[PDB]
Design an enzyme around this catalytic site. Structure first.
Site, short mmCIF file in Angstrom:
data_model
loop_
_atom_site.label_atom_id
_atom_site.label_comp_id
_atom_site.label_asym_id
_atom_site.label_seq_id
_atom_site.Cartn_x
_atom_site.Cartn_y
_atom_site.Cartn_z
CG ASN A 83 -9.92 -4.33 7.51
OD1 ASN A 83 -9.14 -5.08 6.94
ND2 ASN A 83 -11.22 -4.58 7.59
CB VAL A 90 -5.26 0.44 12.30
CG1 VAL A 90 -5.10 -0.83 11.47
CG2 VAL A 90 -4.71 1.64 11.56
CB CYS A 91 -10.23 -2.46 13.26
SG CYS A 91 -11.00 -3.93 14.02
CB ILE A 92 -5.36 -5.54 11.72
CG1 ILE A 92 -4.30 -5.05 12.71
CG2 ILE A 92 -5.47 -4.59 10.55
CD1 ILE A 92 -2.93 -4.88 12.06
CB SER A 136 -12.18 -6.67 10.54
OG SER A 136 -11.88 -5.81 11.63
#
Length: 167
Positions: A83, A90-92, A136
């Site tokens: 993620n 940061v990919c949330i 993700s």
């Protein structure tokens, strides 16, 4: 600008809420006092995970229209998480506004909303750290290696924490 002034008020409310109910292993705040819109965050890796003992510095940039839009977060150190994009982004879900890139019906209390906070964001990053989610895939390799060769993943995680400690 009234929008920016209101954004500032909001940020102070967040900063206050953080400083009074400090979260375990997180320590965040404005880097420099001259600008409350740019934050720094030291996230320590979760106690019984492959990231334990790691100290991961990150930068959170808040838009002048906050809380209507989410902030941008990226790690300053090296990382290897499904993620986290190869450059630290940061990919949330919570950092995604309604009408973005990936989705998933299940992401209701998962998309950005004025009802969120830096507390919930950080709280979520730490969680993301302990238990990944290659759903993700911001980092192909890491997503692959996590669901396929977890064996080596843990190996690299350890190198990642060591690097974060300047070893």
């Amino acid at each position: 600008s009234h929008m920016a002034g209101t954004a500032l008020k909001r940020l102070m409310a967040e900063y206050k809420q953080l400083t009074l109910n400090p979260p375990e292993g997180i320590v965040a705040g404005p880097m420099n006092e001259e600008n409350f819109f740019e934050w720094e965050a030291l996230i320590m890796g979760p106690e019984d995970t492959c990231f334990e003992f790691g100290v991961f510095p990150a930068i959170l940039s808040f838009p002048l229209d906050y809380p209507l839009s989410p902030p941008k977060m990226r790690f300053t150190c090296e990382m290897f998480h499904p993620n986290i994009y190869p450059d630290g982004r940061v990919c949330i879900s919570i950092l995604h506004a309604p009408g973005d890139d990936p989705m998933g019906y299940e992401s209701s209390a998962e998309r950005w909303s004025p009802v969120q906070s830096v507390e919930k964001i950080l709280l979520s990053v730490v969680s993301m750290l302990a238990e990944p989610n290659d759903e993700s895939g911001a980092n192909v390799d890491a997503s692959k290696m996590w669901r396929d060769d977890r064996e080596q993943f843990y190996k690299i995680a350890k190198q990642i924490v060591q690097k974060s400690l300047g070893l």
